[PDB]
Design a protein around this ligand. Structure first.
Ligand SMILES: N[C@](CC1c2ccccc2Oc2ccccc21)(C(=O)O)[C@H]1C[C@@H]1C(=O)O
Ligand SMILES: N[C@](CC1c2ccccc2Oc2ccccc21)(C(=O)O)[C@H]1C[C@@H]1C(=O)O
Ligand SMILES: [Cl-]
Ligand SMILES: [Cl-]
Ligand SMILES: [Cl-]
Ligand SMILES: [Cl-]
Lengths: 437, 437
């Protein structure tokens, strides 16, 4: 029922997991980082573009923002509002979960509405024919498989074993790693999978022990699966050199109480830099100055376990989002770059189709989505506005594969993940900073 | 803007090409046979089912009927009305043109709404994964390719040449014939195509003459392409034994003025029988008793070139649809069988999910479209209501491939197409009635 509907000459649709997938109820609690923060980054980006005197000087961007409630079917129903509009919906920003972005993309292509996801990393969305109106500022996860294969090939690690989670993430990732290993003459000792139980991980650990020549284990697993496998490795006192995808990444929750077996592990994470101006914008928001966001009062009441309006404690008027209770969500840069990619494509389109004017001409009021996607959006190339990193898409509409390389080690009586490298198209490692086990 | 919206316990969506694809304007003239007649066959079928005391005894069927205007994009926009409904839209009947049914099917699968086409014959719609909510009472055209290959194999015609129209119909049909010929050890001399010009056909005829050993020509062409190729064959005085798909069929317009070169031609047509009770129902309709159809007054004014309400002649009050100006459209049986297939699937579903009641229970008010399609609709098997011919679908949702075999000949100083056989799964020919050339 809730929405953010702001008028403009051109309107961008937005889809965010503002609320978690509910349990009795369809929608759960507010999602603070993937929902509120990401939605406010798109509003921040719109405000900035509208303020800019060089980008779309005569065209004001409006918005139509909706909650996906972290569910495919709910997001599809919401997306009908963007299709009914045929508000001048020029394109859609979102969603977050790949399963939501797949269903939205199946609908939007039918009405030729371009879509840019700032978070969906499934390999399926790369399909030029099935998702011919979809683009993304994030790279697909199959580039992690390529980056891991390139890390092994560098260290000449020719004999390895693999563990994968069940589902799109784990299966597609190890299937891509298997192919990337074959091309690099890397032989896979044993390939294990993990379904949806404590014993299951011990069966995998035992099966990994059956090939003692393969000291390197390559993981393409979800967070919970990664923690549980390292726990079973801890129980069996089985120490391996783990090479893992972002499912493990640089999360301290994974290695907690199992740092011996997990020592020297090589992990990947999506490389991103914070948007400093966003921290200032987000920390200044309060229930008194943020009337345009209809979810903000529930976000505030939930974040601070208080009531703004008697069994509930009254919100102290001096509460604030600040350094002690806030950290910029890892994908804020991708939200901002997605909105700017749409603006840059629209700007170039208006300049070509509306000669000798800055205003939105008739040729663009009857907007050709096919032209916008193929001839403008897929051909954008600009410097990220708050970074010199380039925003651009390949012919599949995929953003550039840039990952940080981490090494789990202890220096100065503290266990931390250390940034020991980066993968862009070529691997770059600071080898003399890596610890082994 | 116009529609037929009739309330019921369960409502069926309907899509018909009531108006032709417009030219200035988006929608053209009324389409009398594929539009008005086919829409009235669905209303006839609904009335009959509702009157029946054994089929859905406690569930009244309603309708929501819309004009596709013979265009993909217009039909997609119309279909949003069936999706917005989530009226209790249980399923959709239509469309006619395969291009319209493809776009509708792309939308309806997303909201799990089963769809039955009474006319769309494209091979694409057979795809179990891409069109997983689509079924049809007509067979796909690739069964014509199989039937023609079986006619050649019977007469031991091992050396043949092929001509195909450009587009889905001709290309897919000859591609399927090429595969069906390989399996029957039939060698193809030359494979010609026809684009979108009088000279083009002469180039094909000349190229066919280059292989004089191949006296049999297999055609998979559109009506206009078929007439023009027989015209070029007439000009080059090139007489062949033509084996053609329903694009030519038993149309006298194809052979007009070119009966010598076209003599003895073997052609296919979709086998159908008229629904006798429909003739009585359709011929009784007049502008005074048909208020539920909002397009009928324009149909009447167009059919009779008159005005019901001064430069226009006033409609004579004694005008009527009758034997002199009406003939039952060839696919009326498929419209009626599509509506009955949906009713039978709903009837079996209500009997299983609503025990000890005939009424629509809560388990069916929140209708599971996935169950309706896979467990009920794909498993129907009933005698056609106004025929003993069986209505059933295969695992792809395709209706049974039943074609009549025609032979163009002269008997008693009159040129006519004679029914000389039938193809169901096995070919059946009355060989001693076939003329050659
Ligand atoms: N990138 C996500 C997550 C990504 C993923 C991709 C496809 C399927 C499953 C799947 O689950 C995992 C599990 C572990 C690590 C990464 C993923 C996406 O759903 O695409 C998106 C939720 C993330 C966000 O909103 O930041
Ligand atoms: N069966 C049709 C027509 C069928 C066809 C199928 C796919 C592509 C093109 C194509 O065009 C031809 C040409 C000649 C003969 C048969 C077809 C369909 O569009 O499916 C549908 C309009 C017919 C109806 O409403 O009766
Ligand atoms: Cl989402
Ligand atoms: Cl998954
Ligand atoms: Cl149609
Ligand atoms: Cl065609």
């Amino acid at each position: 029922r809730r929405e953010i509907k702001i008028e403009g000459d051109l309107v961008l649709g937005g889809l965010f997991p503002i609320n978690e997938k509910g349990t009795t109820e369809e929608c759960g609690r507010i999602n603070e980082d993937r929902g509120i923060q990401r939605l406010e980054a798109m509003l921040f980006a719109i405000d900035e573009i509208n303020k800019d005197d060089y980008l779309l000087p005569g065209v004001k961007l409006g918005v139509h923002i909706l909650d996906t409630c972290s569910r495919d079917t709910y997001a599809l129903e919401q997306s009908l509002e963007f299709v009914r509009a045929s508000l001048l919906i020029a394109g859609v920003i979102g969603g977050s979960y790949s399963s939501v972005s797949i269903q939205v993309a199946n609908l939007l292509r039918l009405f030729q509405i371009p879509q840019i996801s700032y978070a969906s990393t499934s390999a399926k969305l790369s399909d030029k024919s099935r998702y011919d109106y979809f683009a993304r500022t994030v790279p697909p996860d199959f580039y992690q498989a390529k980056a891991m294969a390139e890390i092994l090939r560098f260290f000449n690690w020719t004999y390895v074993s693999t563990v994968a989670s069940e589902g799109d993430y784990g299966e597609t990732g190890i299937e891509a790693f298997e192919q990337e290993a074959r091309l690099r003459n890397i032989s896979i000792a044993t390939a294990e999978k993990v379904g949806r139980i404590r014993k299951s991980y011990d069966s995998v650990i035992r099966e990994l022990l059956q090939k003692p020549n393969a000291r390197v284990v390559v993981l393409f697993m979800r967070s919970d699966d990664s923690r549980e496998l390292i726990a079973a490795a801890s129980r069996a006192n089985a120490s391996f050199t783990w090479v893992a995808s972002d499912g493990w990444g640089a999360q301290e929750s994974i290695i907690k109480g199992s740092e011996h077996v997990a020592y020297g592990a090589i992990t990947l994470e999506l490389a991103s830099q914070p948007v400093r101006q966003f921290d200032r914008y987000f920390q200044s928001l309060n229930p008194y100055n943020n009337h345009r966001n209809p979810w903000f009062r529930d976000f505030w009441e939930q974040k601070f376990q208080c009531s703004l309006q008697n069994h509930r404690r009254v919100c102290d008027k001096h509460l604030a989002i600040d350094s002690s209770n806030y950290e910029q969500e890892s994908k804020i840069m991708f939200v901002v770059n997605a909105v700017y990619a749409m603006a840059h494509a629209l700007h170039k389109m208006q300049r070509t189709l509306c000669p000798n004017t800055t205003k939105l001409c008739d040729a663009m009021k009857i907007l050709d989505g096919k032209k916008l996607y193929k001839d403008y959006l897929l051909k954008i190339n600009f410097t990220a506005p708050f970074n010199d990193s380039i925003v651009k898409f390949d012919t599949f509409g995929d953003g550039m594969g840039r990952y940080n390389v981490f090494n789990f080690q202890n220096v100065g009586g503290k266990y931390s993940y250390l940034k020991v490298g980066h993968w862009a198209e070529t691997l770059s490692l600071d080898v003399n900073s890596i610890h082994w086990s």
